[PDB]
Amino acid sequence: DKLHSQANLMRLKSDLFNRSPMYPGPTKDDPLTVTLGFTLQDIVKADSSTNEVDLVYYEQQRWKLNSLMWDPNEYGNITDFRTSAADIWTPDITAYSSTRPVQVLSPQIAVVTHDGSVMFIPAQRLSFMCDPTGVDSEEGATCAVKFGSWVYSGFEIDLKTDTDQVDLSSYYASSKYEILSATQTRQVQHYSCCPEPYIDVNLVVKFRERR
Amino acid sequence: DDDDKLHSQANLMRLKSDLFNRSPMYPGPTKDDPLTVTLGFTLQDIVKADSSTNEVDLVYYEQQRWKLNSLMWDPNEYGNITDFRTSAADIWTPDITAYSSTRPVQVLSPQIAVVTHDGSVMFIPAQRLSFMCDPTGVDSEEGATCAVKFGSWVYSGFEIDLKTDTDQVDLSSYYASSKYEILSATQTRQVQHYSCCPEPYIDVNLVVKFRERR
Amino acid sequence: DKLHSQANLMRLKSDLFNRPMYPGPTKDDPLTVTLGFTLQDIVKADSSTNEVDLVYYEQQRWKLNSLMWDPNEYGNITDFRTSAADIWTPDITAYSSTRPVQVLSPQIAVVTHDGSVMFIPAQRLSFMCDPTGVDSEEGATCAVKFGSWVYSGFEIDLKTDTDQVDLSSYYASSKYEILSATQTRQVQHYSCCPEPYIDVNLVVKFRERR
Amino acid sequence: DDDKLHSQANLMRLKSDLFNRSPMYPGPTKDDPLTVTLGFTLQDIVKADSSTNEVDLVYYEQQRWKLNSLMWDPNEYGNITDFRTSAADIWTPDITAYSSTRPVQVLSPQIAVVTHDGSVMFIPAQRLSFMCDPTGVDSEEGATCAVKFGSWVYSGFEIDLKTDTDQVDLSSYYASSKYEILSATQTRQVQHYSCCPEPYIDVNLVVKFRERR
Amino acid sequence: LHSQANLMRLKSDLFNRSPMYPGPTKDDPLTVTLGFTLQDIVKADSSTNEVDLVYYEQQRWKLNSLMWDPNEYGNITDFRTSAADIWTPDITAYSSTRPVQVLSPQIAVVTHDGSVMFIPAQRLSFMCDPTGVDSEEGATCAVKFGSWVYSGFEIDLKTDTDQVDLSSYYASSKYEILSATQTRQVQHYSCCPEPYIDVNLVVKFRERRA
Numbered sequence A: 001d002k003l004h005s006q007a008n009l010m011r012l013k014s015d016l017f018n019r020s021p022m023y024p025g026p027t028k029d030d031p032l033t034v035t036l037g038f039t040l041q042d043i044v045k046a047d048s049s050t051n052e053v054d055l056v057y058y059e060q061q062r063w064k065l066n067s068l069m070w071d072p073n074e075y076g077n078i079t080d081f082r083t084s085a086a087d088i089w090t091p092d093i094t095a096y097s098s099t100r101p102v103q104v105l106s107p108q109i110a111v112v113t114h115d116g117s118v119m120f121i122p123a124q125r126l127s128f129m130c131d132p133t134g135v136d137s138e139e140g141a142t143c144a145v146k147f148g149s150w151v152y153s154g155f156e157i158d159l160k161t162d163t164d165q166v167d168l169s170s171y172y173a174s175s176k177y178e179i180l181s182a183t184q185t186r187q188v189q190h191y192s193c194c195p196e197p198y199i200d201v202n203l204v205v206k207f208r209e210r211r
Numbered sequence B: 001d002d003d004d005k006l007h008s009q010a011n012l013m014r015l016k017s018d019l020f021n022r023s024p025m026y027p028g029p030t031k032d033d034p035l036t037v038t039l040g041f042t043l044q045d046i047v048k049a050d051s052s053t054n055e056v057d058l059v060y061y062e063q064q065r066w067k068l069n070s071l072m073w074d075p076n077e078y079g080n081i082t083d084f085r086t087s088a089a090d091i092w093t094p095d096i097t098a099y100s101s102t103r104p105v106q107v108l109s110p111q112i113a114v115v116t117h118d119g120s121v122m123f124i125p126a127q128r129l130s131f132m133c134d135p136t137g138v139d140s141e142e143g144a145t146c147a148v149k150f151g152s153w154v155y156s157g158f159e160i161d162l163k164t165d166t167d168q169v170d171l172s173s174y175y176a177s178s179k180y181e182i183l184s185a186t187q188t189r190q191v192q193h194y195s196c197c198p199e200p201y202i203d204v205n206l207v208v209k210f211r212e213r214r
Numbered sequence C: 001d002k003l004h005s006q007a008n009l010m011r012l013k014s015d016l017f018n019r020p021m022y023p024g025p026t027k028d029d030p031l032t033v034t035l036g037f038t039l040q041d042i043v044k045a046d047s048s049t050n051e052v053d054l055v056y057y058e059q060q061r062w063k064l065n066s067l068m069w070d071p072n073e074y075g076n077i078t079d080f081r082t083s084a085a086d087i088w089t090p091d092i093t094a095y096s097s098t099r100p101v102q103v104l105s106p107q108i109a110v111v112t113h114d115g116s117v118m119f120i121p122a123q124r125l126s127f128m129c130d131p132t133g134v135d136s137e138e139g140a141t142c143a144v145k146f147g148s149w150v151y152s153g154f155e156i157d158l159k160t161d162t163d164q165v166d167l168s169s170y171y172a173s174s175k176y177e178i179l180s181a182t183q184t185r186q187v188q189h190y191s192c193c194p195e196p197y198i199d200v201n202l203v204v205k206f207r208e209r210r
Numbered sequence D: 001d002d003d004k005l006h007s008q009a010n011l012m013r014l015k016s017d018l019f020n021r022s023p024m025y026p027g028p029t030k031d032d033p034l035t036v037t038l039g040f041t042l043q044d045i046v047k048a049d050s051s052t053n054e055v056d057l058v059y060y061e062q063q064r065w066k067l068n069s070l071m072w073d074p075n076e077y078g079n080i081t082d083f084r085t086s087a088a089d090i091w092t093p094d095i096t097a098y099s100s101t102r103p104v105q106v107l108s109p110q111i112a113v114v115t116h117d118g119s120v121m122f123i124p125a126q127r128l129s130f131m132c133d134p135t136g137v138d139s140e141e142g143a144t145c146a147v148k149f150g151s152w153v154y155s156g157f158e159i160d161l162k163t164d165t166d167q168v169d170l171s172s173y174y175a176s177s178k179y180e181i182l183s184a185t186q187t188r189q190v191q192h193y194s195c196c197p198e199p200y201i202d203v204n205l206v207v208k209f210r211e212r213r
Numbered sequence E: 001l002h003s004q005a006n007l008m009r010l011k012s013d014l015f016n017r018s019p020m021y022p023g024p025t026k027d028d029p030l031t032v033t034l035g036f037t038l039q040d041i042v043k044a045d046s047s048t049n050e051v052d053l054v055y056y057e058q059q060r061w062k063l064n065s066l067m068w069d070p071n072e073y074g075n076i077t078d079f080r081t082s083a084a085d086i087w088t089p090d091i092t093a094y095s096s097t098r099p100v101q102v103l104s105p106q107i108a109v110v111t112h113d114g115s116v117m118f119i120p121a122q123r124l125s126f127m128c129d130p131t132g133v134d135s136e137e138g139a140t141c142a143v144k145f146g147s148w149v150y151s152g153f154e155i156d157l158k159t160d161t162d163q164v165d166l167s168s169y170y171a172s173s174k175y176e177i178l179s180a181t182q183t184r185q186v187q188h189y190s191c192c193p194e195p196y197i198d199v200n201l202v203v204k205f206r207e208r209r210a
């Protein structure tokens, strides 16, 4: 039985990653919707001598590919699987105001469901540009960082949020800084060069020293 | 004796050939074919406790054991070889993660597992971890207390079940001249429930109580 | 229709990349690279070591006949995205760095049907810079030269579109404000050598914000 | 000149015979044990940090072993008696500092010397941070620290460790270091765990040092 | 022209149709010429006795197996190629305290006579007591470079000059250079009859007087 459930899963992955191989990313003809959400774990550091703030968070990324669809009946009623993030295409979602390379804290493994949808949730430590003036007051400090594709326009990758509230439910209760509010908002930009719209998600965090 | 050693080498190379190079890559556990992973921790040192950022750095050994039927063999068919060492990259390993780490975990030991003929794998990486921890009280008699949870990043308890052999962290090789002394260290399996999800989620909670050595 | 356009792109790349990589330029077949810097932040000015850390976007453009194709032979595809590790890229180097350059963006280029490539890496650079005067009204001045490490001007020619560094996205709440930022193409000759060598000189004047 | 082409060809063929026309040595077993000889040479104590009780050491770790599968007859190969090869082309032992606090940083090219009798010589230069309380380093007695080295996964039934001498080589120790070495020993130890019938072997590096005046 | 096609053919011919050069032996020794160019002394830490240095290490050698006749290949006399496509010598700083950090592209120039020129830029931390750096005579520091595994019977070292090149030393460094020499030395070990060759880089420096 368990030998057969393995054989089914092994066959499924072969059928997907070895027939009509590596999806080449989205195009204007075949656009992609990526949904972004953030879960904030901890503000680790606020350096007022370089105006850098260090953040630990989960970035939840979701998208759907027809080329990852399968009928569970063709494959022993397998409805989802786990696979390495290097085995599939992933979107190039970038923090636009980072000051150091993003550091990856979690295994980089995705979950693929039979409808072709992919959930990928990397935990990261990010240093970005932020003046924490007022962090030692009641008002606190406010900082913003924008995330988006580095090379794809809104005509190839459409970004969405399900909610504009950052999930704070697992924020570390004994951090040096407390979160007054945290929002994530979709924005459309245009550039004078270019006709296409460009999408980002603006993460706005207001925070202050713990009392 | 030279031939006897060549024979034993040929059998080991043939064993590994038959397991790794001519039998499909194990795709991981499913709800249909679940896996039990046993965790235990050996604490070697608390290196640093930073109250300016609430980060603490530990050095520990993390013992991982699991068992796959697809790694079984009969010693009799392979010159009575009962186990072998292999690179951890040659086999599937569980995605056990420190959930509250603040920096990438740093591996201190070679990445090599021991595989036994019953299909059990023993893998013991030595790691330095920075994690979230408020060390207030560390310079008092009562000490500070810190907790870090370990578990799969992507699997539920229907795919990867975690166990412990004991709830006591092994402190028998804890460094005698550390800046901090350990008052207590426990490791407890926890069943977690998320309101999103019907499945159980498992983690092992490592709770360390410690203070400055006088 | 979506399956066909995928298959078109897949085959274009295979035709371009799986059938003899460009071995770089020669005197007989020189390459022109255009550079433009966008300065995002001056992160740190260390007066104990005379190192300054910048964050900037570096726009790199060039054109290869070996990356050309006719859109009509490939389902009207006019450009595509690809990993910078699928194509040759110029060896443009900051000549006065004190640490390995740190890459902040995904390393992906855009290739257009006319053979043009656009590659825009975001980088954090530590380079040699005496920040004396930074706490005064005149500010400090620092200069860093970029260019090819191994190719002369006869193989890789560097150009800028403009001599003005783009400051439109510079961080409003940086510790340092920018008084001026220029990027100037320069030609040099060494006594050893008859060939010209090109560099772009990034000159930044800055001071502590008030 | 031509004869240089031939000795090249000979060495190319020797490496090909050893590494591509033969399966990779799977490591030692209880049936086919291996002796690894270990020696330490000490360059510099870089840092003694009494805020974290970590000390930084730069040292050469000399490793020697011998494999039948790396043997050849020099007469068959243009009278070549040894060669150099990337360490990644051959099996190497998993010798580890047991009390490191950071990943070891390698300072030398990872290249070994193989001799026609099958002996391999591999001498990696490393910077190691390890657990060490430097109390007394500012005194005449100095501080004493110890670190154990050995296989991470093999028992003494598979890898026997040995030393040629119990004196650490201090002949190259940096003369202008912040710290002078009073003494440095390296001692083979046989260890027993109550879990396990097999003997386990480590080499215990004991270093006595103080601030130089 | 496709002096492009000529270059591509030459590289195929040298690399993938004449196996990877195995390195030198007693029967086929190799001379490496070494020369240093100092860009900056970045840091001198008297709490650990480490000094951090930024420099170019010019490496030159010559292999018969890299020779060709320019007339067989459209009069191509040289080319650039990745340092990972050819053998390079294992020249090491013997007294480093941290891994060397590479600042430049790893690309070599190969000439038709079989000569290779490779010039990596590096930041090196090495053992050095900077006592007297704040005095008139300054501090003196020495670091030896040489092969890690080859003897003088396999790799002979030489320099072209005993003067280190200071003509591009950073003029606003915290430290000025009083003198900088590079001298071939021979060492023996009592175990062993063979000579061992190194190049000793001796730098005398002091705090720049402001």
Ligand SMILES: CCN1C[C@]2(COC(=O)c3ccccc3N3C(=O)C[C@H](C)C3=O)CC[C@H](OC)[C@@]34[C@@H]5C[C@H]6[C@H](OC)[C@@H]5[C@](O)(C[C@@H]6OC)[C@@](O)([C@@H](OC)[C@H]23)[C@@H]14
Residues within 6 Å of the ligand: A096, A097, A098, A145, A146, A148, A149, A150, A151, A152, A153, A189, A191, A193, A194, A198, A200, C040, C057, C120, C169, C170
């Ligand atoms: C390829 C690199 N890429 C990175 C960029 C980076 O964008 C941002 O940093 C950004 C985006 C929205 C809002 C604020 C942004 N931003 C800043 O610009 C500074 C600060 C750190 C910040 O958050 C992503 C979006 C787009 O590419 C898909 C860019 C724009 C598309 C187009 C635009 O030309 C003007 C613009 C680019 O300049 C070059 C491109 O030329 C084809 C680009 O480098 C980025 O512009 C900021 C911008 C392009």
Ligand SMILES: CCN1C[C@]2(COC(=O)c3ccccc3N3C(=O)C[C@H](C)C3=O)CC[C@H](OC)[C@@]34[C@@H]5C[C@H]6[C@H](OC)[C@@H]5[C@](O)(C[C@@H]6OC)[C@@](O)([C@@H](OC)[C@H]23)[C@@H]14
Residues within 6 Å of the ligand: A041, A058, A121, A170, A171, B099, B100, B101, B149, B152, B153, B154, B155, B156, B192, B194, B196, B197, B201, B203
């Ligand atoms: C895929 C990433 N994964 C990481 C997570 C991370 O979990 C934790 O950090 C965690 C787990 C137990 C107890 C405390 C935890 N925790 C925190 O949440 C913050 C703090 C650092 C910490 O220790 C592992 C367990 C499970 O995945 C197998 C997660 C949960 C399963 C499920 C849950 O949805 C609410 C939850 C996820 O949010 C997303 C998933 O969606 C299908 C997940 O990202 C993590 O939740 C925190 C949580 C999931």
Ligand SMILES: CCN1C[C@]2(COC(=O)c3ccccc3N3C(=O)C[C@H](C)C3=O)CC[C@H](OC)[C@@]34[C@@H]5C[C@H]6[C@H](OC)[C@@H]5[C@](O)(C[C@@H]6OC)[C@@](O)([C@@H](OC)[C@H]23)[C@@H]14
Residues within 6 Å of the ligand: C095, C096, C097, C144, C145, C147, C148, C149, C150, C151, C152, C188, C190, C192, C193, C197, C199, E039, E056, E119, E168, E169
């Ligand atoms: C191969 C390494 N390469 C790095 C160099 C580095 O050049 C620079 O750093 C530089 C270039 C222009 C202006 C100022 C420069 N400069 C400095 O020289 C120091 C300071 C950091 C700085 O900005 C690139 C240009 C050329 O290579 C295409 C070089 C020159 C070509 C030629 C010149 O010989 C005198 C010179 C090289 O010395 C060796 C070469 O010998 C064939 C070279 O290493 C660099 O010289 C500075 C210089 C060569």
Ligand SMILES: CCN1C[C@]2(COC(=O)c3ccccc3N3C(=O)C[C@H](C)C3=O)CC[C@H](OC)[C@@]34[C@@H]5C[C@H]6[C@H](OC)[C@@H]5[C@](O)(C[C@@H]6OC)[C@@](O)([C@@H](OC)[C@H]23)[C@@H]14
Residues within 6 Å of the ligand: B044, B061, B124, B173, B174, D098, D099, D100, D147, D148, D151, D152, D153, D154, D155, D191, D193, D195, D196, D200, D202
């Ligand atoms: C595979 C990982 N491995 C690392 C170990 C680590 O050993 C040491 O750190 C060590 C060895 C001798 C003396 C002191 C040691 N040591 C300490 O234990 C703390 C301190 C840092 C230190 O120096 C190497 C030796 C042996 O494996 C060949 C171990 C022992 C063999 C056996 C022993 O079980 C009790 C023991 C292991 O615990 C697990 C094993 O279970 C099959 C092991 O993880 C290490 O135990 C310390 C110990 C094993």
Ligand SMILES: CCN1C[C@]2(COC(=O)c3ccccc3N3C(=O)C[C@H](C)C3=O)CC[C@H](OC)[C@@]34[C@@H]5C[C@H]6[C@H](OC)[C@@H]5[C@](O)(C[C@@H]6OC)[C@@](O)([C@@H](OC)[C@H]23)[C@@H]14
Residues within 6 Å of the ligand: D043, D060, D123, D172, E094, E095, E096, E144, E147, E148, E149, E150, E151, E187, E189, E191, E196, E198
């Ligand atoms: C393989 C590693 N290798 C590194 C060595 C390292 O040498 C040096 O560090 C060195 C060389 C010349 C002068 C001073 C040196 N030196 C020091 O010894 C300390 C200080 C950092 C320094 O500059 C290179 C030269 C030779 O290998 C080609 C070595 C010598 C050849 C021979 C010598 O043994 C007696 C000696 C080795 O000890 C081991 C070898 O055993 C067969 C070696 O590890 C280095 O010895 C210091 C020495 C060998």
